[PDB]
Amino acid sequence: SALFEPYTLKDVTLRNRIAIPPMCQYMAEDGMINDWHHVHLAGLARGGAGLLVVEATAVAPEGRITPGCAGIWSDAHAQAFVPVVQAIKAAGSVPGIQIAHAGRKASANRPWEGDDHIAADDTRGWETIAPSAIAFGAHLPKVPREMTLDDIARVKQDFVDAARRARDAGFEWIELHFAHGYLGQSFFSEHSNKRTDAYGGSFDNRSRFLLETLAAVREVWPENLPLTARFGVLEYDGRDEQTLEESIELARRFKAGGLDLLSVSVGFTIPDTNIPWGPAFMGPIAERVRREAKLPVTSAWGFGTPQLAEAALQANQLDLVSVGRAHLADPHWAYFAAKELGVEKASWTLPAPYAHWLE
Amino acid sequence: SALFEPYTLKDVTLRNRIAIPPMCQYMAEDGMINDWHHVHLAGLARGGAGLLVVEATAVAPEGRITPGCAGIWSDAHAQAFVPVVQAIKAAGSVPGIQIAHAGRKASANRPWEGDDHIAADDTRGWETIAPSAIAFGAHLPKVPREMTLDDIARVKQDFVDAARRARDAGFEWIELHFAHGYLGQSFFSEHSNKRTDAYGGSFDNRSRFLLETLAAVREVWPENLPLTARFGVLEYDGRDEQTLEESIELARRFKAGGLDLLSVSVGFTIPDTNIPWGPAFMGPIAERVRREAKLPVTSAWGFGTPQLAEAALQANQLDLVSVGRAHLADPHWAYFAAKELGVEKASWTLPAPYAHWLE
Ligand SMILES: Cc1cc2nc3c(=O)[nH]c(=O)nc-3n(C[C@H](O)[C@H](O)[C@H](O)COP(=O)(O)O)c2cc1C
Ligand SMILES: Cc1cc2nc3c(=O)[nH]c(=O)nc-3n(C[C@H](O)[C@H](O)[C@H](O)COP(=O)(O)O)c2cc1C
Ligand SMILES: O=c1ccc2ccccc2o1
Ligand SMILES: O=c1ccc2ccccc2o1
Ligand SMILES: O=c1ccc2ccccc2o1
Ligand SMILES: O=c1ccc2ccccc2o1
């Protein structure tokens, strides 16, 4: 089966094509991860996936989505990941991390605690920053502060510091979070970026924050470890052909700038959209990006049906299949997939103390 | 559903009737548990089961089954359990432990490393002890040394020390391992106990080691925490009616001696048996013990089909249903069961960072 073929990118080899995408847990305290994360991540790694990407981890305190978000904005924050990385490696999975800045979507409640911007007088909240002083709307009505050029330089450096820390903590795979309406996505989108300086207006200017951040990170991230990004390539906002064309052009620039793989997503930049949800719905758009930018891709949404994951790989729509919620339901989803797809000795997807008894 | 009704025994309340029975991992080193066990057990606890019983944990080095067995024969061994117990409690499951001595079945290879007695000249092995100098046979040919009265006193005290350590490490549930052909079972069975002193011959004498050990443990184990045992009540050796009658009589004595619940098993004392394996096959024998000894029971073997677990509870065959291998396959089996049995808000069997997204 295609799903269980290994994959090599730079010096890193994944044992199969199952990636666990970043999934926020909302369990950190002042950015510091804890035994919630340790057990969650080590357990996932033991389930058999080839790659485990740690949740959106904030490069700066104000770049958390919520008060429960993980952070890597100090060396002490980074140190907290060391034992988890080591446990992921012990289980034979590749440890990755998504480094992030939530931009105008920051300072929000946890999803089971209202999912909305935190009230102004709640002592947990903070001022958000963005390309322009324009609110997302809906459940995220807070108007962000327009970034200064010095803010832009500082956030870029925060991404570099985060990547350097990720490297030194032992991560073997990094993903820059340029998707889902957060800071990077919001610099790219005309909906959110009304700047008239070097960082807004034209395609080149809207691309600039993303490209400069990638280039700056590339200076500290080892060339032998995959350098990746997540990027929303359309919005389902009635401007999809134009948006896709620009996004694919930016993907070509990312590739030329050393990006090894793109995780293809939806932008979620604004709320007034009409996303055609369905199992594997992203496959055709991922395939178009893959083909037109000639860049390896992953995508997600509904690939927990193992036959869908297999079909996407066989059709060359994807290079890796990201499977999120199914792993929250069953940490050992990769074993279920192995059985479904008829992998010989399927139980040996798991470590010996499980595999021996399930065979 | 019956499976998701809470259960109170002494001062302890289980959130549902799902018990995870002891399952050896064979991952300890010189008896010391490690991050294998931490993540395994914490992950299981988060999956939703009401009770998690830690694997057979040796009361003495020679009472390990294998070189990978957990031990609790020193305070330093016990300390290693403290963070795991605390993680189990944090997840809302009740932490239990099975304390054990493998008797003539000790000094064996791990199951995926031959499953047989360790060769005499292998530096990992050790002399086994038992009631009588008689081998199990088959893959366990080693003849054990016949215990002296001082050996008997010492092993009893090792069980007391183990129980005291379990208590002080924060366990809320203890299970004495008097099943599966190990030391305790082998004192009860005429197949393995040919002693002609106070510890063999008559029913009273064959019962004596088990009853004295229970009584000694009872002196240090808090009266407000469940005191339980696992015991093989028949062998499927052509002597089942006689063996069951004696085993039920011993169960009555255990109850009179403060036993709160019996985990009903098969003896596995000798290899030449004909066990009628099948899904839930133990239900009727568990029910007979429950009824005739008027004692709460659990049992196992094939209850990973949630409807079977439900039916056994509704028929009053069992008070708790133990589900073993299905939890190795899927740590979140209790969530699967909740869905199968139509529990409202089934995903909230799991903690918020999972439940919110699966609802
Ligand atoms: C609990 C949860 C948290 C998520 N957190 C992130 C995250 O940190 N970064 C990100 O880019 N996407 C995040 N996502 C999106 C997932 O990575 C994924 O794309 C999505 O869940 C769809 O895949 P699935 O159908 O397999 O779950 C999250 C999704 C879930 C359910
Ligand atoms: C990996 C493994 C290890 C076990 N170790 C123990 C143990 O430590 N003590 C014990 O009394 N039974 C042990 N057992 C038996 C289980 O507790 C249980 O009775 C059995 O697996 C049947 O239940 P199941 O069909 O749900 O797996 C073990 C079983 C397995 C599969
Ligand atoms: O980038 C993100 C971060 C969190 C999150 C939670 C649910 C769904 C999607 C998400 O995307
Ligand atoms: O897959 C594995 C195999 C062995 C192991 C040992 C310790 C911790 C984690 C492990 O994961
Ligand atoms: O008491 C025990 C201990 C280990 C074990 C392993 C497999 C099956 C049954 C077992 O019982
Ligand atoms: O079920 C839970 C809920 C919360 C929690 C926090 C830290 C560690 C484990 C936990 O388990």
What is the topology?
The structure is a homodimer of 359-residue chains.
Chain A: E1 7-9, E2 12-14, E3 18-20, H1 35-46, E4 51-58, H2 75-90, E5 94-100, E6 129-130, E7 145-146, H3 149-169, E8 173-178, H4 183-188, H5 203-218, E9 227-234, H6 240-256, E10 261-266, H7 283-293, E11 297-299, H8 306-314, E12 320-322, H9 325-329, H10 333-340, H11 352-358
Parallel strand pairs in A: 3-4, 3-12, 4-5, 5-8, 6-7, 8-9, 9-10, 10-11, 11-12
Antiparallel strand pairs in A: 1-2
One coumarin binds next to loops of chain A.
PDB class: oxidoreductase
Keywords: TIM barrel, FMN, oxidoreductase
Assembly: dimeric
Describe the structure.
- The structure is a homodimer of 359-residue chains.
- Chain A contains eleven helices and twelve strands.
- An eight-stranded parallel barrel of chain A has the order 3-4-5-8-9-10-11-12, surrounded by seven helices. Chain A has a two-stranded antiparallel ribbon with strand order 1-2.
- The first copy, chain A, is of the alpha/beta class and 359 residues long.
- Chain A has one domain (1-359): Alpha-Beta Barrel (TIM Barrel).
- In chain A, β9, α6 and β10 (261-266) form a beta-alpha-beta unit.
- At the A-B interface, α1, α9 and α11 of A face α1, α9 and α11 of B.
- Bound molecules: flavin mononucleotide (2 copies) and coumarin (4 copies).
- One coumarin binds next to loops of chain A.
